[PDB]
């Protein structure tokens, strides 16, 4: 997807590592992801000057520099592939944001992309039985608890 | 700046690690080249002998 | 086929050195990419400080990378020259070695013949002579006694370590600069916190 | 002496290329030195603009100089390889060329001799043979044709 980032960061594209080194995966929700993706090189100065956008990035633990924005976009897209958090609803959010940012490129890339294994309810059962095991271990070691 | 320094030291350590295998391979290549030379010389000596 | 094998081996060694340089390069360029654009968060954070940091990390290619590249290029040059020497004295001049040793043995044979008083070639002698013609004493010295490839590699490692040390000192300069400011701030803080005196 | 002369000539060519690179380098580095530190004059000038200029001109080594140096190094490598070829095929193998052509003419002389039955080297032939041994067709091609 280096061609995509070349398309959306025409000259300001930086030397960056295309992988989601995301450490939380829940750092930001889908609307926030769509906003971060809509920081195309033509809106980036306005976004960085917007107080609300600065608040948002401080909430997400971002800077307002070019490099961190692009790195966050990389991580968002790789989560969109691998951990597969977004749906067509992320595309919904980008269409909503098109009021400001006519970001057709990332829109199409998210549309036309082999998504991934989905795996939802198996993961739900796995996490729930993890929590059950933790509850049992807590019960092992007090009667009121 | 500390991060940059640590990255440099990490690169140094990686070089030190890899040079074990790298130097052993280079030694092996030295010996290979020598023995290829000697094999060529053996062939040429055999064929010089043939035409006596 | 032997010559092509050795050529591929030389290319492999060159590729390994190049890969080392590429590793370091990618790390350094990621550093530049991050800190050429780092911006201050909230006021009172000395805009000039951040600007200077950005400029420095921007030129960090010059600062940290090109010397390594030059060292790599020098090593590649030396490797290529050594391979050329091996090619042109041994793996191309085998025909000439054959002709020289063959004619020498012929002349020796005829010298033996011209003793018409009844008063001839061993294979070991032929092997030794062809070995000498193929320059295998010289290449024995360069491959075993004074290994050329090994010396090149060790030079690369030692010079890269020296370069890393130089870079470390250079960065310690920046850290001392920061230490100055830090000490000033701590002086002010201790003055404020010990004014109940 | 001939070999040393040619070596010095090769070094001279390399030095000329290096001097070209040095010219360009000195100009570029002076540009960097001036404009890595240019500071704004008046209240209404864009401090950020000047900061970005300073960073850009600071990286101007990367931007404008290193490619030229790489090209120079490649050229130097090619020159050195060519000189080594000339050395190892011609200006060191003159002894071997002598031995080869000498033994060849000796064997031809003896071949002429063994035609008994009441049935030798000309200088032009010897010159041509020694010329071929010194690879002077190859080096004529590399020095004049190509």
Residue numbers in the entry:
A (entry chain A): 1 to 141, 144 to 147
B (entry chain C): 305 to 356
C (entry chain C): 408 to 526, 534 to 611
D (entry chain D): 408 to 526, 534 to 560
Describing publication, verbatim:
Here we structurally and biochemically characterise the DLP pair from Campylobacter jejuni. The tetramer is dominated by a 2-fold symmetry where Cj-DLP2 with its symmetry mate (termed Cj-DLP2α and Cj-DLP2β) form a central back-to-back cis dimer flanked on each side by Cj-DLP1 (termed Cj-DLP1α and Cj-DLP1β).
Crystals of Cj-DLP1/2tetramer were obtained in the apo state and the structure solved. Both Cj-DLP1 and Cj-DLP2 have a core DLP-like fold with GTPase, neck and trunk domains. The N-terminal 16 amino acids of Cj-DLP2 form helix 1 (Cj-DLP2H1), which inserts into a groove within Cj-DLP1AD. Here, Cj-DLP2H1 is partially clamped by Cj-DLP1 G-domain helix 18 and terminates in close proximity to Cj-DLP1 hinge 2, meaning it is ideally positioned to modulate Cj-DLP1 conformation upon binding. Connection between the Cj-DLP2H1/Cj-DLP1AD complex and the bulk of Cj-DLP2 is therefore via a 9 amino acid random coil linker only (termed Cj-DLP2linker). Hinge 1 acts as a fulcrum with the trunks of Cj-DLP1α and Cj-DLP1β assuming significantly different conformations relative to each other.
